[PDB]
RNA sequence: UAGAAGAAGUAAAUAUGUUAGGACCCGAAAGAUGGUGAACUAUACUUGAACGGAUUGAAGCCGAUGGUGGAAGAUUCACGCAGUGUUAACGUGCAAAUUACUUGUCAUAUUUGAGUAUAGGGGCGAAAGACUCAUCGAACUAUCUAGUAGCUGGUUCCACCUGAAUAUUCCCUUAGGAAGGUCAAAGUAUUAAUAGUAUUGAUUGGUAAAGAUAAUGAUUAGGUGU
RNA sequence: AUAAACAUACUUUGAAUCGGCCAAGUCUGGUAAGCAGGACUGGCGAUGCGGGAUGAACCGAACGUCGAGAUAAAGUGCCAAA
RNA sequence: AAAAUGAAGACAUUUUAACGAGUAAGGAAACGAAAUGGCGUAAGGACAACAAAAGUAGUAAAGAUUUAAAGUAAUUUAGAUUGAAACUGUCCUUAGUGCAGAUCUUGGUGGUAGUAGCAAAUACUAAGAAGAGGAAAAAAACAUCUUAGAACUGAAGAGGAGAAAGGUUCCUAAACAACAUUACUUGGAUUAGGGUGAAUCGAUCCUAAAUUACAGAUGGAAAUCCUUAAGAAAAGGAUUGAAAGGGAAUAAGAUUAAUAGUUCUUAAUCAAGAGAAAUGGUAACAUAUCAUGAACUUUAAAAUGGAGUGUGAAAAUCUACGGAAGAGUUCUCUUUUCUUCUUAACAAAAGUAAAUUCCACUGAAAUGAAUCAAUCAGAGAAGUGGAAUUUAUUGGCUUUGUAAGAAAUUCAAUGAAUUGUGGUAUUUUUGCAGUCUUCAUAAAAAUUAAAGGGAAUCUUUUGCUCGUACUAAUAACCGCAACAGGUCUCCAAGAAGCAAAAUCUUUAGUUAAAUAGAAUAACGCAGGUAAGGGAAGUCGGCAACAUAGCUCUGUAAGUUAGCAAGAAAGAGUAGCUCUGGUGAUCGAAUCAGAACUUUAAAGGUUAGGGGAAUCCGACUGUUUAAUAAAAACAUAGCAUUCUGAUAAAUCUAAAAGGUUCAUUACAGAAUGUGAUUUCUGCCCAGUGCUCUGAAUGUCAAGGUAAUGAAAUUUACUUAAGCGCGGGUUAACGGCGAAGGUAGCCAAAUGCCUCGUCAUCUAAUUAGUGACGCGCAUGAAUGGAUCACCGUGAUUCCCACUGUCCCUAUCUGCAAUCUAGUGAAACCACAGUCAAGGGAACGGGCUUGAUUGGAACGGCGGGGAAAGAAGACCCUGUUGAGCUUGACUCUAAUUUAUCAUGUGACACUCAUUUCGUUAAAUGUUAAAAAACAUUAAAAUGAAACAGGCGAUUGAAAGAGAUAGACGGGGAGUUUGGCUGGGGCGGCACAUCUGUUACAAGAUAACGCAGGUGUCCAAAGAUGAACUCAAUGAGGACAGAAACCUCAUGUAGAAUAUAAGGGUAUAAGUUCAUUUGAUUAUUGAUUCCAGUACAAUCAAUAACUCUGAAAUGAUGGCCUAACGAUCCCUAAGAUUUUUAAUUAGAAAGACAUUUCUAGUUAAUCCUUUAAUAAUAAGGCUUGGGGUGUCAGAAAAGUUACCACAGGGAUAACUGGCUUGUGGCAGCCAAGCGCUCAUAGCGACGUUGCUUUUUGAUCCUUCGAUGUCGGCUCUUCCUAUCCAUUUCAAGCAGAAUUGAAAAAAGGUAUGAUUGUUCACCAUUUAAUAGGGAACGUGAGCUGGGU
RNA sequence: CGAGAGGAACCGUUGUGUCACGCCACUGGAUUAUUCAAUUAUUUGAUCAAAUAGUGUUGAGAAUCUAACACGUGUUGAAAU
RNA sequence: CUGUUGCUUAUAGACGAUGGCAUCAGAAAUCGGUGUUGUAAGCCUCUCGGGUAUUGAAUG
């Protein structure tokens, strides 16, 4: 038989990430002094669309903690981000909205966003719009706090890993219908290129494990063990249940 | 049941037969290995180029239902492009896919150049096993390679002599082989080593015929007695 | 009884072949077949010649090149010898 | 063959006799009485004038062509002509040694054949010139150049230029052999020269997607990875990457046969060089350099989508006023129509704009301001007065310098004349302003300027390298070419119109672009028309007709409320003469109305046919380049699965390797269904998947222990997986684990079927609506529903028409003929028929009919015409794509063990994953979008640690081994016989009766059956007895219970199929027993005289039975079964050796033999010798191959391929004729009586090839496979018409039959249909054949 | 003929359809005599006269060809069956 | 005698062929007759005008 679709998509050609008019990366300054023992401010200069993803990017601006100049970073915005505000990172940071805090310095119930899983990471969950991670429990015997992610799993971090108190901005992005695939062939500009998705059962034994005979149907189960080799792994994967749930 | 029983072998040059090699000559679809291709086409990115005229009339706005407004992967015409029909032309063509008319489409899932990226059990595919330089249900090129072929075709001077076969056994055997029969050529033996014939003599067989209150089986009727 | 010395007995080595088909005072399956399959023999294949107008197999008869004669199958109105 | 003769004769001896066909095949050479005889080609060794010049040859070699002779023939010999330098004869040796074929290879050449053709792109004509080249009885045509006429492309061009590509094709002169389908004096062709000029245009420079180095990482290797991370490398990161992106700076005129933002004239510009730090304005901000401004930092620029509206300016077009100059028309007018009236880069600043944003004064409500639209205002409107910027260089437009001295248009013969002012018009270009739109927000760098800071104190020179010619396409490029194909752009006039549409014209280009003339046949290709009818044609309205612009009136059901809609339907439209409406302080085309006239008006060109239903897909979109554009794919919507990022998916041999990921669940990855509405029923048994679970059901290498001299052996303990248990069907799936729920239906799904009933029509295999036990509907395999949409499928109406009744006719180009030029396919030889036979459909053969030689135009009957080693079917021990618990494996994944960090869980120290400019680690001491740096001062600014900061962690990764899983992938296989193959069967190993023919052998998928077993007795033996059945008797007892006598040839039994055999037995009963044993021979059956197997006859043991003779090496006989290799059992003491006692005889200064006693070892080998284990040998059994002389083996190809086959199927033909069809004989009866007017049962005899079978003879290097249309001919078994006879014939209408095949035999609805069935009409609407007539005749509905 | 109901035939006359052969008088169709006239667009300064739109279009339209659409002939005799 | 040739020949015709004439031949205009259209151009009237008319029509 052929190599299938997914196969193909693992040495990316023409399914690199189509990142050409993005703004940069986004995750918080690199961890200093002046961040774990003191405050730095930072000005929110702009806000800006960063091509394919979902949520507004902020241009801060922190002036310099040890050397003369300036130091342009780029946030995700929080929600209720405005330009020219003050917003402060560091330890001692106030409780406010935008700020970016060490996560055992939120109260319990607090919540954050761009959450660090590893402290000086610069922001790993809770990223993408409208997402957010509540704080959960602290536990000072060991230094670690307990997060809920936003798929709803628990997580126990560092109690220093660091995160920005808010709801990422750009909510209710997914909850407008798509009308057109003209309008679905534009979302992924900035993206990868999978959007036009041929069924396997369409396809001949040759391309898909699907591909089928005289009938357009499956054949064999779809449910498949983990173990499966690529190439044959097509369908849902150690799907513990299956079908319409109750 | 091999051997011995006053040794017969060996060498080399030919012919014939068996055998292996390109193997009498030409013939596969295939397999593997190493390279070359995205000047055609498929997709993606970078940077450029290309919307003229009508129809219709969504929000929003103004007035006392009328205006305004100009939205939409809305309707159409044109420049272009395609290829629905004629199953028209042509069909040793203008053309290894074109021409004419009719038809469709003719800017946002649009069209297009150049640069660039992806390579053969691979790529790319709005999916037809489609496209990957007139080559694709696995490209092109060179080597292994004069691949193998129980199968098809061909196999080159004269006179003379002899002259067949379709039984039997075994086979993954049924378009083919080996044992064997028929045939030829060489080489012997004075040779209990002649007969596809008849006669006489002693046999063998169960066919044709014959039989059917002779045994087995089938079958029409008539007397006589109980 | 008859025949048989270029009789008889062979030995070695080897070729080709084992798709067969036809006839009938024969047989089986079949309604039957220019059908399928057999027993014995003669043929065609491998074979020309004379005759059946023509014909692989029928009939006569098998072949070095010729001359003259008697013939075979079968023929004798003409084509066509009688 | 036999005799005779035989050293050399000669002809391979003399005589005599017999004999002579031949495919496949054989007969090598030598062999005196020759074990076949010879011819030819080439080369090698010899021989070739015997007396010391020794084969032939310039007194003519080889070769070629013919003429004769010899030979049975292969061939040889000689002559003549041609040819001029080598060659030949004989014997041996040697071989790249003899051609008619191979779709053979290479080359050359015919017929076809002077044939098909040189027919798209509207078109040429007259005079003259040049030239060999328009002559001539018209030889009707004549290439190039100029002029005149007539025309075409029609400014999205057949115009003027570029990018790629080409590469000298550019220009000129000479010249025309070849080339451009005639010709050429022409040419993109031949020859020779000439031609491409840059500081300002590009490349060069910068970076984009991307690309490549040193060191490093990885790999067995080649090499791969990394691109700033890993580095003592690069203030921060290397190379390359754009002639369309970014970018310092040049214009006008003239000039060349050709180059020109490049040369010349004039006039410019740019870059790089040389000669205690200012004012003005309230402010926004402004001042021919002015008026300093370093390190460092920041900002801005370069540099950013699209749509639509309004508007400023320029240009083009149009137009108003005033002319100057030239040209056109002019006996008819026209103060007329036409042409020119221009001006650059770079700068200046008389006069004067539009838009936007800011500044000052004041403070808006009775809210105002304004736009086409909007939009705005106490974080301040309007007003007044100002500042700035944009408007194709300075500063937008006029104007000015350049600069009229150029150029344009004229006039004279170089010299003179002119070169105003406007427009509330259209289009293009270029900006601007706000509006809208995105789950899209629509480059970077080189490089430039400014700011914050306050360190320090006009002239002139040069401007390098490379490209620059030409085409850019109906002839310069890519397609074999001067190919109707393809190939990226720039500029862009008039009329008319909504229009860049069609049509015509101007500037420019061209009249040549594979030759023409005459004629005006058929048949064509392209374009048309048509009486009356109007789809009756056809599979089907295919094709054609038809509708068509604009204005007004009007517009239905349905509907997702948006649409349907240009629904449908109706009226108007011309020309001329007028009037009115729409503005500014003269002008725009637009609208409305009114008279009058006519050929009554969109229609030259352009320019929707409409309606009523059904099916599918929701829609826009995409698709099989070259037969499928769709109902297929995509789509949005819906739903499911996994994943916390060190992850999921996934590329890689590996990798501080790669992709989604510059990412983080509103995300990434994997799937199914396919908008909306309504609804998604029941099932967890099976296969999947999953579990937060199961221990001692089964599980590997290992680890532990025991024995042994050790290998070995044994026992125990070990993971995942499988098994058990729970969950899951918008998982695979099923719906009589649960029995099809809601719905839907003869459906694109229903065989029967042309289902039944309605309706549509005159007529309905079609359509629609109902019905539903539905072969075989059904719910995200999604069920039902359908508004809008569709180059989708289907049916019916209206309208229209050559589709048709039924054809006629017109035009152009061909075809015809001619001049010039000039192919190809195909070709065994060829070319009149009938019948026969033949390979069963002859051009050739046999017999007839018949024939005059050469051919032109047509034509499609034949040449089973050409094209292609059939693609359908079968066979190969031939493949390939795809599938799957087919067989055997494998990557990926997974589990267990091993691989040594410390301290007793804790730590870090290897290891993992990270982050930074390794930038304060560890221990001590939310008012404000602003600035923050190069320190004063006398250290400021704290010390130390053996950790750059975290995370993970002795666990995990990679390695090795072991188990699991693994069509993701690799290799391969997928029996045979066979009235084709498959399905079936086994005729595959096997036994009996029969076919079977009285020896043996002996066929069929012939007939009736059987075997893969059964038996410690059913084997062996001895003895006794007689069986089945019947008759007659005996309590219950009877037709059958048991007893007695008699008869009883087997009619019983004998394991079994059948056939044989058997009566003091081979059957029954009783008794003993294990011969159903070991060893050695020789035979018979099958047979190749192989094995296995079976059948015997003997011999040596040891036994059994019997008194004994005998009998017994399995079964009463004929079936009841198995090689090599491998595994596993049993057997090899009968005898031979050695050492030491006792005795004896031979043996050179030891040692063997014989005899008895003893003790030990003993089937052979493991090769230096032994030993006990282990293994290997030898003989004989078992384990088994049933395809039974014995591979280890699943499918599907409609995507298919190869070698072949008529050894073999699908069609014709041929034999047959069961079946189909037709016709007879007899006569029981029917026919009121009456066998025969008309019938005819029970029987029986034929014919036909118009049915279907049966067969496999022809065809597999191909005979185009159904029907219909068209057209001809034939048969008669006659439907009509003509002539007759009979009747249960009164007439009429009919019925049976004879002569007779010369003439007729129809139109339609449904269906592809042949057929069928309906509605008509007719004198009748008969049946059939001709390769199931007829595809280089059509059509393509069926297949 | 027949009870009736119904119900013929020969001769003679007149037509029609089809097939065959023709034919252009009458009737109809085609029409590039681009014949004559009208008219749309473009270009000839205007009139006239034209050309172009490959036959611009329309109306009438001779000739020639032709009708299934016009119209003639094949009603024709002897002998043997 | 026949053929060629001429009448850009017809009663014929793809080309041949066939038919006619060939110096009293043929061709040509012009005129008359005969048709078609519809009333020309210059100034409703001139005007039943003008135009065409064998090309495959009929006289002279």
């Given at each position: 038989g052929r190599r299938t679709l997914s196969q193909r998509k693992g040495r990316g050609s023409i399914f690199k990430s189509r990142s050409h008019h993005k703004l940069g990366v986004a995750q918080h300054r690199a961890i200093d002094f002046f961040e774990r023992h003191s405050t730095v401010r930072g000005l929110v200069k702009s806000i800006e669309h960063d091509p394919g993803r979902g949520a507004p990017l902020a241009r801060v601006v922190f002036r310099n903690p040890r050397q003369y100049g300036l130091d342009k970073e780029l946030f995700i915005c929080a929600e209720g981000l405005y330009s020219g505000?003050?917003?402060?990172?560091?330890?001692?940071?106030?409780?406010?909205?935008?700020?970016?805090?060490?996560?055992?310095?939120?109260?319990?119930?607090?919540?954050?966003?761009?959450?660090?899983?590893?402290?000086?990471?610069?922001?790993?969950?809770?990223?993408?719009?409208?997402?957010?991670?509540?704080?959960?429990?602290?536990?000072?015997?060991?230094?670690?706090?307990?997060?809920?992610?936003?798929?709803?799993?628990?997580?126990?971090?560092?109690?220093?890993?660091?995160?920005?108190?808010?709801?990422?901005?750009?909510?209710?992005?997914?909850?407008?219908?798509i009308l057109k695939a003209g309008v679905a062939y534009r979302m992924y500009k900035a993206k990868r290129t999978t959007w036009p998705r041929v069924r396997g059962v369409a396809m001949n034994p040759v391309d898909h494990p699907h591909g089928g005979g005289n009938h357009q149907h499956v054949g064999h189960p779809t449910t498949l063990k983990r173990s499966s080799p690529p190439g044959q792994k097509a369908g849902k994967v150690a799907a513990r249940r299956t079908g319409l749930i109750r």
């Open positions: 505000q003050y917003i402060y990172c560091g330890s001692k940071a106030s409780l406010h909205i935008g700020n970016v805090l060490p996560i055992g310095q939120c109260p319990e119930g607090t919540v954050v966003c761009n959450v660090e899983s590893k402290p000086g990471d610069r922001g790993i969950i809770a990223r993408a719009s409208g997402n957010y991670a509540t704080v959960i429990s602290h536990n000072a015997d060991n230094e670690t706090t307990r997060i809920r992610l936003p798929s709803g799993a628990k997580k126990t971090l560092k109690s220093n890993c660091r995160a920005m108190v808010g709801i990422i901005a750009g909510g209710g992005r997914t909850e407008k219908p």
